[PDB]
Design a protein around this ligand. Structure first.
Ligand code: FES
Ligand code: FES
Ligand code: FES
Ligand SMILES: [Fe+3]
Ligand SMILES: [Fe+3]
Ligand SMILES: [Fe+3]
Lengths: 193, 447, 193, 447, 193, 447
């Protein structure tokens, strides 16, 4: 579909990702993906982090959120690290973050935080080579309220890979987010997108 | 407020008026007496290694372009066009021989010179004195083992002298380890705190770690995990605190080379640092080789902080009295294997970055302490920093600076605030020096 | 699914509500619920409040939005009223609010307000004992603009019960919202979530 | 601005400069001369009944912890740690024997005393004078029949004296009815208005009800529904207005016991209040028993308002000159049946809470009036409060205070602004008293 | 459904538009519309503006976004232009805007902008007279981030007409948005809603 | 800052301190010396043609109601009720015989008079002097060929005199073409720039067009498309620049009647303007008939700008030093066919409206230039406006005003800033006149 020499603002990665969804439309896969994501978001919104790990997250997961340095659209010489990892977590590292959330001496969690997640624009396609691997794209608005008058709203597109694991349950094996805001105005990014 | 007479910091740095974290008139005054006067962190050689490489950085509220010159030197300029004042460069890093303004197209070199003006001949004739229209240049730019600092004030002490007694503690890691690199790009996050709140916290606050970070200590399983929830006080001689004439200061926690890093990196780090320490024993001596692989929590006055070994490197960029833009880089030893550097860089961001679970523990502490400084009944109240006062020494045979020979105290707060008060009440560097002629005596009183 | 002794941040109510959706998935019920909610939101967005009452709201409705006091996560002794009711309306009380909106001397309504509602994360399940009672969960972002430069955005999760009424039309018989922001920064909460 | 000389409020309270609702320098000055000086509402006995119960409250822009002591008394403290100034308590209510700071773990008792410091022995030795490090205590805390007020100024009049002539009007409901309870938690909403806009509106504004609330009157079907759209003026003798030396004031609408409550609650309320009135006739006399079941719209100077009978209780918490945080509680008579109290509490929030359809009618009035105070051509303009001037009396045989014997007028605005001007131009309570030595004569001129 | 003499706040246009969706519900049309809009939003989010024109936009398109002047709810005499056109674009005018975006001297596009679109509340109905014309209604939240700390969020309802064009591909032939905020607080409205 | 002595603008307008775009104290001072003193655009006859028609407009930060009277005149009033200061009118346009306040129902006529007060007889008796309670009236309201301006200062020059030498250039289009209409409603967008940034840009900035608007020129295919990317400098004699005593100024680009309009409208416009020009040659002479169909980029001091021919009409409404609310209308010639007027109006918004692709090119220029004015190291720096200095003339035989006989220069910036500095340093119009007694000599120095 996309020629990136003509569509000059489109990255090679973005053009690759779109081809994956335009071709095969599978209406029931879109519906399975919607259910999966709605249930994940429900668990996260009620802060059932252990349940999220147990039911939504695969043992081989890579959970990654990057922040890309601002560079010239015309930049061709400067070749140093383009991005940093806000998150780049394996299952054990996610478990550490979950323990931190549940610890009774996490003072920042009292009074209890309030999360509301809005998941939209779900697209789903099976991978062409690994027929057990489901590609899911979705957008999230995440609202976090705490301590009377603190309100932070996060906005992101998520590129996921999900795979059937134990009990035949589809679990997240990769999440990739390129966070759109370079300087965060939300105090921190301490939320599971 | 009359800054000449107002006692914002009491004698010996023992207390500070809470308003210093909230007062906007004082913030404006700091732009002049703190940020326009002192050395500020810009970048690292590793981020601009080749001719034409540049980054943007903040110096106080100003933005500057920091550019590697053809001759290998670094010059820095206000990121503001000399014509009608538009911001020249809108990116964070790149490589170029010059910068062209998008308003009317004036073209400046990497050296700051006005090189071209559209239709100069037809419009200005020979009238335009381009020689006088170069970008406003940062007066002083100096390197501390690859780490580049800038200062707007031509009268400032050389950077090495400015670091004072703190330099001795940094050298094992910064110089004798073979050198450090900064891994970019930085995380960037805005917090609702005064720049001095995280600055003071990193310069001298070991006391808070066990309580504030109880959950992170318990969860992360780092070499300091036993401190969790103030379950245990560190051993006698577990470390020390120091401070210096120009305000820079640090805590030293002996042997804590893996720092905040979670159990997954502890064995590899403890092996690496220990092996280097064994080689350094012969070159710099046992004490200094041990300092190399000890965890230093340091602030380079005014607003640059770091945790060596953990590899956290921070800039607390001031925005207003209750707003700060936090920049977070990772520091790694150049001779570490590349896979270790990558993992160390991720672990720094994992703990202290935009989603840093440790850094998040500190958010409420810093933000509410700063915001309480605006509240009427708190403005004239005294923040306390008297822990360990009357037990500090100066001119010790082994450890230089004003030194508290205990891991936990407020020695470094006192020196930071002593320097802060001397600057805010002074008009120039000469007056700061006069105000600081008995700095160490002021800090060791009752000792 | 959820053990609240292990998932220490999850309330008993939240764990109860989630069990209701994880079990029976009924793809066509999810679709009926989506339609119902999209149509309700359309009527509300165009300020057809009478039509909303007539077509979406059951005569036995309880329409409730609470604000919960901030209490210690560890709090066990203090046992006074935990929440206040921003809304706790029966059908007649909703009708009063609707008349107030339509009154030509409601000065605050001139010039006309602009509403845009975004409904996401719809889940639906039949009740286990009353087979005529449909549980619907959904999240809403509500955008309200007025008077040139006033813009307020509301974010909430809604726990609804809907039941077939007259003409066989499914109508709202209970809506419950626990409003996530304790101190409102939107001038008022005078909107139908 | 020179607050000693600037006429912000004209003689007799007849007009006020519009800038008083927008000027930020004046707002800062009010923190000192209004909020740090006067009595401010904290909480009710019913919200902290048992030892260890506490709530947080605002006093001006400061936050305080209000705690029930072991001996049954109530003490209040700044919610700010004595060490580095962090906010101590992050919740709104609870029960505890003390409060531990999450920064470095200092532990304060319910009595404000510094009780423990982590590793005190190893760190401070015997050096820390904990006795001098208790939370900053609110000087004065007093009760008006269960309603707890605080004052930072030790020189303030006792709360009962401060209420002045207004107390006589409140007593039937607050004392003789058997007592009131506050039903929490409060609604909390930020409006873009100066705190004085809703304060003045509740103290003395009956004029606006028929027009502003036309839609709510018509829709809700309350006992005042005939006022809708200024279709009808209340009868002669339908009520009165009063004001007092220290600024508190109220309107009285005879017999309006069901107040703003919609037809669904009218019969039950009118029965309940009427039955109590019949019993009160013998105890306090006909006039005062009738006052008990008459609707009082009152402001307790400076920023606490209420509608008795309707049961609305408001705190207008100041944030800046065009920002106020509105707290809304319900007040109920303790001896009402529990089901009635629940329904009354819901009805208060239904009408005057965060989604209160009545309260929403007032939003634009308050916000634009306040914001217009910042606009250049309006700053020096005069807000008018002359309605009924020259017909007020003082020292009436039956109704105490400066009293306008009509339901609708601006008597209470004039007394509120007279007290406001006397405070803003005074340095302490002695000077306010000197400025107020002919208060009632100033208010009744031309009478 | 709607009587606008009783539902006094509802405009004739709004009441007309709603009748179109309440009657015929066609579950598969709703699904086709969802796909179309999700794909369009994906192309726009990655800044594949040429691909958007080629694949989503019909040659006969009218792309219109209005801003309506604030007038009294009771206003009956004043009869001058009620609205201005923020956009009122034919295909060629859209192409001009697309060229402007892709031009290497569009300085405002360096560093690259970040867009995230959230499409919700999709409704679809075939037109009653032209059986080749599909009416689609949807709501959008559009998040635009640039230059470190600039973040603008747009909120709108979109009334679309879509028609099969060349290759049988459904393309946009009309988009109408009545922008809800009268005074924009987003620097500009230079985004494709 | 002492505005009497502070040199904010250097002699001859050659430079300006960058702080003028960021300083909030100066912004407050401008409300007084710029906006309360000078003529400000309100509306057009075409927007309020019939008795009772009204619109709201800003004058500086104040809002006014502008109403067509029964006798055909226009009066304007502060949109603020005389009672308690509520905003009277909440809509942007309509038709009415009066305005009733929604707070307490006071009713004011279209003529500003207090006409009715609810229950006046029962409440105020004969006490209320309604005659003294009319809306605060804008002192001066005058028309320039249908374009209505207002001035708070009764001492201001008549609008025609205030336009000075600029009037001669506007008359061909404003008067001799048969007249213009304003097509409303306007686009309204908030930008984060000081009002002077777009004001200066429209008054005299041809230099930026080729570079800033490179993409729009290339993409839109307008009659100026060859300028794209500074690929070509306009011919000799392609235009000129002028400025005037009271600060108004403009660029003239000969023959550019289709202006920014894209190729789709070029042929139709070039035909229309050319045909009218041929008729005007006999009435006003060749030069002035050519001016009619030449593109004028003009600012009417202080904050009203326009592009004739392109038909763009702007108000830069000030909010604070780094915030401006931009209003965008289309101007069309009354005798154009209606279909052309509709298409021209759409094209104005397409290019310069809220989604104007040209206007968007300017956003970063204006916003960063303004915001850089707050940055510490830039406050005292000099914005340059010296292009063409020493080549301007005054009293030319053909072109009046201070005139630069070149299409591109900074003549108009210098005159704008000369007038600005004279106002900010003056207390009233008499002092401005004294400060301006050698205005043209100051501007033509070195010539
Ligand atoms: S502002 Fe940079 S070239 Fe004019
Ligand atoms: S700030 Fe409270 S213990 Fe240190
Ligand atoms: S404020 Fe307008 S009638 Fe009272
Ligand atoms: Fe910490
Ligand atoms: Fe009211
Ligand atoms: Fe431009």
């Amino acid at each position: 579909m996309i020629n990136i020499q003509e569509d000059k603002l489109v990255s090679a990665h973005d053009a690759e990702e779109i081809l994956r969804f335009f071709n095969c439309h599978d209406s029931a896969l879109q519906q399975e993906a919607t259910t999966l994501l709605t249930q994940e978001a429900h668990l996260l919104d009620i802060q059932a982090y252990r349940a999220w790990l147990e039911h939504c997250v695969g043992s081989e997961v890579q959970y990654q959120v990057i922040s890309r340095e601002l560079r010239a659209a015309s930049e061709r010489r400067y070749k140093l690290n383009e991005a940093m990892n806000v998150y780049n977590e394996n299952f054990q590292q996610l478990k550490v973050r979950v323990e931190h959330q549940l610890d009774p001496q996490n003072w920042g969690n009292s009074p209890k935080l309030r999360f509301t997640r809005f998941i939209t624009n779900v697209q789903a396609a099976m991978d062409v080579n690994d027929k057990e691997l489901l590609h899911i794209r979705s957008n999230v608005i995440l609202h976090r309220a705490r301590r009377g008058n603190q309100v932070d709203v996060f906005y992101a597109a998520r590129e996921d890979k999900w795979k059937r694991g134990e009990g035949g349950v589809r679990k997240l094996v990769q999440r990739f987010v390129d966070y759109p805001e370079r300087i965060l105005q939300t105090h921190n990014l301490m939320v599971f997108l | 407020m009359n800054y000449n007479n107002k006692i914002l910091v009491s004698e010996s740095g023992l207390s500070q008026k809470h308003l210093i974290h909230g007062d906007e008139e004082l913030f404006q005054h700091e732009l002049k007496t703190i940020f326009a006067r002192n050395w500020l962190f810009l970048t690292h050689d590793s981020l601009i290694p080749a001719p034409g490489d540049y980054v943007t950085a903040k110096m106080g509220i100003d933005e500057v372009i920091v550019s590697r010159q053809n001759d290998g030197s670094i010059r820095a300029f206000l990121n503001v066009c000399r014509h009608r004042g538009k911001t020249l460069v809108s990116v964070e890093a790149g490589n170029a021989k010059g910068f062209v303004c998008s308003y009317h197209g004036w073209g400046f070199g990497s050296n700051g010179e006005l090189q071209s003006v559209p239709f100069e001949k037809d419009l200005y004739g020979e009238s335009l004195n381009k020689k006088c229209l170069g970008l406003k240049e940062v007066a002083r730019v100096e390197s501390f083992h690859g780490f580049i600092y800038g200062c707007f004030d031509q009268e400032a002490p050389p950077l090495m002298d400015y670091l004072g007694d703190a330099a001795w503690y940094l050298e094992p890691m910064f110089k004798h380890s073979g050198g450090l690199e900064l891994v970019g790009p930085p995380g960037k996050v805005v917090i609702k705190a005064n720049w001095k709140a995280p600055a003071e916290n990193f310069v001298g606050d070991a006391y808070h770690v066990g309580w504030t970070h109880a959950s992170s200590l318990r969860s992360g399983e780092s070499i300091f995990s036993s401190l969790a929830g103030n379950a245990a006080l560190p051993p006698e001689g577990a470390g020390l605190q120091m401070t210096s004439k120009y305000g820079s200061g640090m805590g030293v926690l002996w042997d804590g080379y893996s720092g905040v890093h979670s159990a997954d990196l502890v064995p590899e780090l403890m092996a690496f640092g220990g092996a280097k320490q064994e080689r350094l024993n012969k070159e710099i001596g046992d004490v200094r080789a041990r300092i190399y692989r000890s965890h230093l929590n340091c602030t380079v006055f005014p607003n640059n902080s770091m945790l060596t070994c953990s590899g956290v490197f921070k800039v607390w960029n001031p925005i207003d009295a209750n707003t700060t833009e936090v920049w977070t880089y990772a520091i790694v030893e150049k001779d570490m294997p590349e896979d270790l550097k990558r993992r160390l860089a991720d672990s720094v961001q994992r703990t202290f970055g935009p989603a840093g679970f440790w850094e998040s523990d500190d958010n409420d502490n810093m933000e509410t302490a700063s915001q309480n400084g605006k509240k009427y009944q708190s403005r004239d109240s005294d923040l306390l920093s008297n822990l360990g006062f009357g037990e500090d020494v100066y001119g010790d045979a082994v450890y230089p600076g004003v030194v508290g020979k205990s891991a936990i105290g407020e020695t470094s707060y006192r020196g930071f605030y002593r320097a802060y008060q001397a600057h805010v009440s002074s008009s120039n560097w000469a007056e700061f020096e006069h105000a600081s002629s008995t700095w160490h005596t002021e800090l060791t009183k009752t000792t």
